Amino acid sequence: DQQLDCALDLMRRLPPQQIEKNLSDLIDLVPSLCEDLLSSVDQPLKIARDKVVGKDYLLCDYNRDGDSYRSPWSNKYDPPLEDGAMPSARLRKLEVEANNAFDQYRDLYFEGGVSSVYLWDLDHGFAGVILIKKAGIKGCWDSIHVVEVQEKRTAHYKLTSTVMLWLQTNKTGSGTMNLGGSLTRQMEKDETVSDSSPHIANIGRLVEDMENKIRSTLNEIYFGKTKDIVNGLR
């Protein structure tokens, strides 16, 4: 659709820290684009509180059923639902283990912030999202990792990842400096699945590699390319 292409191009040119306002204004302007735009454009992550367990979790479309959101900690919807969408018993076991592992991953690499993992069954495997949010020192990092697992033994893993990052300083010499934007990348691999190399380990390694690669690329794009451009403006 020409209008969808145009809205997506708008979202690539408008200031990256205003995604929510720009998305909400676009949907106001062409309401029929709402569903397609929300499935194509990444939104900064929102934190909710699981008051039963006393833990924060992240909200996205993958843990939404109707107007409620499922906690990865309690496996319950807020507001409550009678028959909300749930992972199978087998996959809920993996999802608990994945939430615990990525909690630790997050602590070691981010020393703060909030993570959540949601898994869902597929025909010949399963898929999942790994979400990490760390606010700053003003700024915020949001990562969204969507992983698809086909089990053949050995499994095939497909990872699509988006990092959204903004940072702002206010200093005597440089005034106010704001850097904002995003990067999306994709990786694939086959890995052996065993008791010693389980899915969660294969997935963690793939997410780890992706975030390190993305961080390094952002570092040159943010602190390198835009720097060089400034130095040629004057």
Binding site: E20, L23, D61, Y62, R64, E148
Partner: peptide, 15 residues
Amino acid sequence: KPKGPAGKRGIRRLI
């Protein structure tokens, strides 16, 4: 991207 969870009702919406 793989499909999201099955059975999920409701349209996408802004938070």
